[PDB]
Paper text:
RAS proteins are GTP-dependent intracellular molecular switches that are anchored to the plasma membrane, which activate the RAF kinases through direct binding and membrane recruitment, resulting in RAF dimerization and pathway activation. Prior to pathway activation, RAF is trapped in a catalytically inactive conformation by 14-3-3 through its interaction with a specific NTpS (pS365 in BRAF) that is required for 14-3-3-dependent negative regulation, and a phosphoserine (pS) C-terminal to RAF kinase domain5 (CTpS). Genetic knockout of Shoc2 suppresses the growth of a subset of KRAS-mutant cancer cell lines and inhibits tumour growth in mouse models of KRAS-driven lung cancer, demonstrating that SHOC2 function is critical for RAS–RAF pathway activation. Here we present a cryo-electron microscopy structure of the SHOC2–PP1C–MRAS complex to an overall resolution of 3 Å, revealing a tripartite molecular architecture in which a crescent-shaped SHOC2 acts as a cradle and brings together PP1C and MRAS.
We next determined a cryo-electron microscopy (cryo-EM) structure of the 126 kDa SHOC2–PP1C–MRAS(GCP) complex to an overall resolution of 3.0 Å. The structure reveals that SHOC2 adopts a crescent-shaped architecture that is approximately 50 Å wide and 35 Å deep with 20 LRRs, and acts as a cradle to bring together PP1C and MRAS, with each protein contacting the two other proteins to form a three-way complex. PP1C did not undergo large-scale conformational changes upon complex formation with SHOC2 compared to its individual crystal structures, whereas MRAS differed only in its dynamic switch I and II regions. Our structure reveals that SHOC2 and PP1C interact predominantly via two large patches of charge complementarity between the two proteins. However, the SLIM-binding site in PP1C in our structure contains density for a bound VxF motif, probably from SHOC2 residues 64–66 (VAF) in the N terminus. Therefore, in addition to the predominant SHOC2–PP1C interactions via charge complementarity, our structure reveals a previously unidentified canonical PP1C binding motif in the N terminus of SHOC2. Our structure reveals that MRAS contacts SHOC2 primarily through these regions, providing a molecular rationale for the GTP dependence of complex formation that we observed biochemically. In the GTP-bound state, key MRAS–SHOC2 interactions include E47–R177 and Q71–R288 hydrogen bonds, and an R83–R104 π-stacking interaction. A stretch of residues on switch II between Q71 and Y81 forms a network of hydrophobic interactions with SHOC2. The MRAS–PP1C interface in the ternary complex consists primarily of portions of switch I, as well as some residues N- and C-terminal to switch I.
Numbering used by the authors:
A (entry chain C): 7 to 298
B (entry chain B): 5 to 178
C (entry chain A): 63 to 67, 86 to 579
Write the structure that this text describes.
């Protein structure tokens, strides 16, 4: 597995006509999953991260929105990246998107990091299009390889002991980060529990306490839940993805929680913009917003 | 959904020897998955908000060491508990006689003649390795006058929810 | 701070403990940011527990309590220890797991009486050479730390009983650690070890050896001298062969896992190496052909796992695995199942999904105890009639197969509970399904070739969820089909000819 050649064959298309496909032999894609899962398992589930860092949100199967991020913020190794889940489903070019992200994780384990999102379940990607793309392009077995690798993804991460990064949001069962480190993997997201809420919850302002999502897998939370979570464990930012915002980045509950969505023109029917966040040593966070 | 304030908290201590399934039974009940790896335990504290008999509760389950090497802290963990699951493998004969020692230890630490605990027979799905039968389990269960539950933690779970739920009913009885 | 471009309770407990002169003072789970200086007054305190609190640094009055043996500080935010703690000449137990420690403090190196040390889930990067003073140490555990090398002095730890070094980025092990001869619990899981020292075989009594998820290429021949082993785990290890270490270790061997290795054949040795085995995990690594008679001496064996391999044809000795309970052959290249399968009388679960199975053998009707038959993506033209004799089936799926008709023997499977037949181009089915009243879930999704449902199925009323969202149903009116599975259930209840 030449991580470098792969990266070259995938970045060759950069700057060209959008929607162009990149043909990879299947054993690179299987090899990328097998090699990267060990990197996921060796590192802790609750990841500790060091500045400088450039963070992100969701890029659903959109390989030419991804390459725009790497230009604005900078390609590795001259920068460090964190991706908060949801890179598959809905978008047309998903195999190319996930392959590039999985490539930089192998070659830069201490500077590249990927979390887990909701569409990393074996069941959710069945409905929402990732199941179909695997059929026509490569195979049915290759889809099972991805969901095996998705099981070993870290659930949350902590940056400079101040920034808390999760795709979905908090859980009522979370009273200490010690519990997150006790989660056993490889695991599948259940209908209820501590794990599920982290890949599925979402803040909703109206609920002062807790309330059910519009979807029927988990339940929301409120502005008081995050604050009591931040003051207890001595943090100051909860960075999230999951949903779709118009401006790319939106702030919830007095900034303590910021959501980042980086796939503009979602699935071809949205006017949303994309955003990426960079944080330096003094923990100043700056936003690099992609044009709608 | 979950009640905002004044939620009763129950500290359930899972006590037994090594290999009696204390960790797997706790992982199954909390994360709905079965772990096939044998990792010795020192102290694991889980938490969950669940509704039992139309009543919400917090099931603070505290897995314990079991083995004497790690049991240097074991007697301290028993002291703060509220209910005990004396878990013994039906395929492990030795852990069955140790139920008496565990009951004596629980009575000694908490300084009481009778305490709420339930004898739990784990690994019941291993029928062709079963060595402790149901009547043998029950006669010792009534010998100490404690409830008896059959339980398997491998998918699909058998009474795994019931085992924790039954003790919660037992604890609120007094 | 990021920018955009308990004390009252604890003091009372100390006062109480000071009055009763108790050997124990418990301040655990009280979330104390700072342990009070008053702790010094209680000199005669055998044990102190401060775990799960918010302490960042201990006060220097800990040194005053010489009459102390047990200290618990785990799950805190500690970064350093006071130097006055060296005055404790009687301390033998220290708990410092799940902390923000960056390196092992020099204070710990100056405690001779210490016996058990818990340094786990920290940011320890180096281990100093001044552990010779810790001659009385017996329990040392490091579970989540960033050490890169172990000091050469560790071989002098004669009193050490358990060494737990996992997830600790170790590139090598000291060659002289085998001079302890008193360790039975050594774990090196999820490290980066490249090789094992040859002196590890001098450990006469070793029971637990966690050695998975490390980039080993082989194992030392000397390791076979440890006759107390029970479970040898080798997941994600670049191993291709073993030097007959199993035969010499056939003493208390229980389970063997060789998952996700780079294997290409079974380890070179006699069939006796699996005499006392109980489980096996040979998944994710190519195996090709299993040799004949290699499982003859496995009198006890419960499970086999062979997922993600290159199996082409099962060996002719398949019929002699009478003591085997479970099997798993998913994601392989199996072509034909021989008639010898009739000998597996005790078998209970059999999975054969993702293979090339045109037709099932007629010997399947002999195996009474079977409960599972997963045959997804096998390209099955039709099932054999021998399914009627079996009784104990409870969950079988035939998804992604080319079957168009089912055998008449469906009503005999009275124990059947879960059946999956979707995406199979099914046209018509026998009426015997009505006898099966215990069904709960059934799948016929994405089948364009069925038009009418049997009237006898109307008698099955215990079905709970039916997935027919994507189904043509040309003969039946779209209103009842698109109304919902429940509306069809009532349509079965009285609109059907049966009552
Ligand atoms: N078949 C079956 N196996 C079980 C069951 N419960 C646990 N196990 C087995 O137990 C093993 C894990 O043992 P574990 O629970 O960690 O041991 P323990 O009893 O908690 C004591 P220790 O502190 O030494 O770990 C798993 O490999 C699993 O196969 C069960 O209900 N059925
Ligand atoms: Mg345990
Ligand atoms: Mn999402
Ligand atoms: Mn999303």
């Amino acid at each position: 597995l030449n991580i470098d050649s792969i990266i070259q064959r995938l970045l060759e298309v950069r700057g060209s006509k959008p929607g162009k496909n990149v043909q990879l032999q299947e054993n690179e894609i299987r090899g990328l999953c097998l090699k990267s899962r060990e990197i996921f398992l060796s590192q802790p589930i609750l990841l500790e991260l060091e500045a400088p860092l450039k963070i992100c949100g969701d890029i659903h199967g959109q390989y030419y929105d991804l390459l725009r991020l790497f230009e604005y913020g900078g390609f590795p190794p001259e920068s460090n990246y964190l991706f908060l889940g949801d890179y598959v489903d809905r978008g047309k070019q998903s195999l190319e998107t996930i392959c590039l992200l999985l490539a930089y994780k192998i070659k830069y384990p201490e500077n590249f990091f990927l979390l887990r999102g909701n569409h990393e379940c074996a069941s959710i990607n069945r409905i929402y299009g990732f199941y179909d793309e695997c059929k026509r392009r490569y195979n049915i077995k290759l889809w099972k390889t991805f969901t095996d690798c998705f099981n070993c993804l870290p659930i949350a991460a902590i940056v400079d002991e101040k920034i808390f990064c999760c795709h979905g949001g908090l859980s009522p069962d979370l009273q200490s980060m010690e519990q997150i480190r006790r989660i056993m993997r490889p695991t599948d997201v259940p209908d209820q529990g501590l794990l599920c809420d982290l890949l599925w919850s979402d803040p909703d302002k109206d609920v002062l306490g807790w309330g059910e999502n519009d979807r029927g897998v988990s339940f929301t939370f409120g502005a008081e839940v995050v604050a009591k979570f931040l003051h207890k464990h001595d943090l100051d930012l909860i960075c999230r993805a999951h949903q779709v915002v118009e401006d790319g980045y939106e702030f919830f509950a007095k900034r303590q929680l910021v959501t980042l969505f980086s796939a503009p023109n979602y699935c071809g029917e949205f006017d949303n913009a994309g955003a990426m966040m960079s944080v330096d040593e003094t923990l100043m966070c700056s936003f690099q917003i992609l044009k709608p | 959904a979950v009640p905002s304030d004044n939620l009763p908290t129950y500290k359930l201590v899972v006590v037994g020897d090594g290999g009696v399934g204390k960790s797997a039974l706790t992982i199954q009940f909390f994360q709905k998955i079965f772990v096939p790896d044998y990792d010795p335990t020192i102290e694991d504290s889980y938490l969950k908000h669940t509704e039992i008999d139309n009543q919400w509760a917090i099931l603070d389950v505290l897995d314990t060491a079991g083995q004497e090497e790690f049991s240097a802290m074991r007697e301290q963990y028993m002291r703060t508990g509220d209910g005990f699951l004396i878990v013994y493998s039906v395929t492990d004969k030795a852990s069955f006689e140790h139920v008496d020692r565990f009951h004596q230890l629980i009575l000694r630490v908490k300084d009481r003649e009778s305490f709420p605990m339930i004898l739990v027979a784990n690994k019941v799905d291993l029928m062709h390795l079963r060595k402790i039968t149901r009547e043998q389990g029950k006669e010792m269960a009534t010998k100490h006058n404690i409830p008896y539950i059959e339980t398997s933690a491998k998918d699909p779970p058998l009474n795994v929810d019931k085992a924790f739920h039954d003790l919660v009913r037992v604890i609120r009885q007094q | 701070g990021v920018a955009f471009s308990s004390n009252a309770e604890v003091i009372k407990e100390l006062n109480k403990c000071r009055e009763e002169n108790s050997m124990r003072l418990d301040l655990s789970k009280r979330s104390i940011h700072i342990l009070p200086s008053s702790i010094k007054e209680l000199t005669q305190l055998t044990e102190l527990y401060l775990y799960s609190n918010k302490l960042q640094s201990l006060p220097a009055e800990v040194g005053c309590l010489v009459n102390l043996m047990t200290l618990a500080l785990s799950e805190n935010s500690l970064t350093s220890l006071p130097d006055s703690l060296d005055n404790l000449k009687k301390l033998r137990m220290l708990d410092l797991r799940h902390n923000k420690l960056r390196e092992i403090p020099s204070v710990v190196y100056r405690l001779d009486s210490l016996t058990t040390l818990y340094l786990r889930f920290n940011r320890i990067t180096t281990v100093e050479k001044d552990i010779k003073n810790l001659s009385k140490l017996s329990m040392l555990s490091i579970r989540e730390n960033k050490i890169k090398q172990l000091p050469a002095e560790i071989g002098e730890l004669c009193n050490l009983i358990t060494l737990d070094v996992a997830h600790n980025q170790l590139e090598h092990l000291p060659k002289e650690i085998g001079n302890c001869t008193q360790i039975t619990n050594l774990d090196l899981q999820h490290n980066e070890l490249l090789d094992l020292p040859d002196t590890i075989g001098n450990l006469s009594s070793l029971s637990r050896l966690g050695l998975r998820y490390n980039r080993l290429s082989a194992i030392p021949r000397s390791l076979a001298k440890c006759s107390a082993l029970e479970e040898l785990n080798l997941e994600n290890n670049n191993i291709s062969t073993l030097p007959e270490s199993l035969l010499s270790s056939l003493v208390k061997l229980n389970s063997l896992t060789l998952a996700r290795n780079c294997f290409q054949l079974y380890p070179v040795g006699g069939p006796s190496q699996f005499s006392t085995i109980y489980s096996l995990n040979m998944e994710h690594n190519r195996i090709n052909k299993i040799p004949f008679g290699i499982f003859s001496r496995a009198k006890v064996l419960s499970k086999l796992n062979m997922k993600d391999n290159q199996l082409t044809s099962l060996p002719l000795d398949f019929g002699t695995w009478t003591s085997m309970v479970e099997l798993n052959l998913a994601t392989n290249q199996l072509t034909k199942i021989p008639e010898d399968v009739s000998g597996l009388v005790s078998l209970e679960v059999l999975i054969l999904s993702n293979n090339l199975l045109k037709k099932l053998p007629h010997g399947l009707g002999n195996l009474r105890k079977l409960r599972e038959l997963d045959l997804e993506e096998n390209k099955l033209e039709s099932l054999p009639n021998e399914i009627a004799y079996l009784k104990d089936l409870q969950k079988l799926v035939l998804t992604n197969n080319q079957l168009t008709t089912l055998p008449r023997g469906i009503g005999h499977l009275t124990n059947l509970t879960h059946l999956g037949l979707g995406e199979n181009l099914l046209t018509h089915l026998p009426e015997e399904i009505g006898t099966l009243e215990n069904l709960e879930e059934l799948y016929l999704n994405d089948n364009p070739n069925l038009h009418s449902l049997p009237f006898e199925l109307a008698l099955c009323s215990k079905l709970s969820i039916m997935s027919i969202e994507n189904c043509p149903l040309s003969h039946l009116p779209p209103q009842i089909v698109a109304g919902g599975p429940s509306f069809i259930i009532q349509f079965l209840k009285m609109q059907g000819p049966y009552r």
